[PDB]
Amino acid sequence: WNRKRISNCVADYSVLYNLAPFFTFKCYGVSPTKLNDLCFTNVYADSFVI
Amino acid sequence: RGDEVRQIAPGQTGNIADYNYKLPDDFTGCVIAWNSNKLDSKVSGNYNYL
Amino acid sequence: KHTPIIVEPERDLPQGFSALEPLVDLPIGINITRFQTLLALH
């Protein structure tokens, strides 16, 4: 487990969308393209191999 | 490029849609796409598409 | 919640009413099933 409490950031999902290697992308609860219009109290990021 | 042909759809938002070509909200019609390496790929790379 | 209490009977709670307020939230996110107190010893 490598959960990261990301803080002191701007959620610049534009450059994340510009990121090339990451291919598959989906969201649940919100539309996939709405990430750029969201604010978060805390950011919980997890990385795994599936 | 292939991985973002999913981007071009009504109501969707993306770089190509934001800056190049996007469908109207009330659009009706059809979309077709297919592979083109046999006719457009080039050794050492092409440069006619910008 | 914190309070000073003085009462004559012992081994019984002081009847009445109280309240609590939010203090701390933590993102730890772990399956916890047990706990134990921590005392100072000498």
UniProtKB/Swiss-Prot annotation, chain C:
Glycan-linked positions: N31
Effect the entry attributes to changing A19V: In strain: 20A.EU1
Subunit text: Binds to host ACE2. RBD also interacts with the N-linked glycan on 'Asn-90' of ACE2. Cleavage of S generates a polybasic C-terminal sequence on S1 that binds to host Neuropilin-1 (NRP1) and Neuropilin-2 (NRP2) receptors. Interacts with host integrin alpha-5/beta-1 (ITGA5:ITGB1) and with ACE2 in complex with integrin alpha-5/beta-1 (ITGA5:ITGB1). May interact via cytoplasmic c-terminus with M protein. May interact (via N-terminus) with host bilirubin and biliverdin, thereby preventing antibody binding to the SARS-CoV-2 spike NTD via an allosteric mechanism.
Function, as annotated: Attaches the virion to the cell membrane by interacting with host receptor, initiating the infection. The major receptor is host ACE2. When S2/S2' has been cleaved, binding to the receptor triggers direct fusion at the cell membrane. When S2/S2' has not been cleaved, binding to the receptor results in internalization of the virus by endocytosis using host TFRC and GRM2 and leading to fusion of the virion membrane with the host endosomal membrane. Alternatively, may use NRP1/NRP2 and integrin as entry receptors.
Stated name of the protein: Spike protein S1
Portion of the full sequence shown: 206 to 245 of 1273
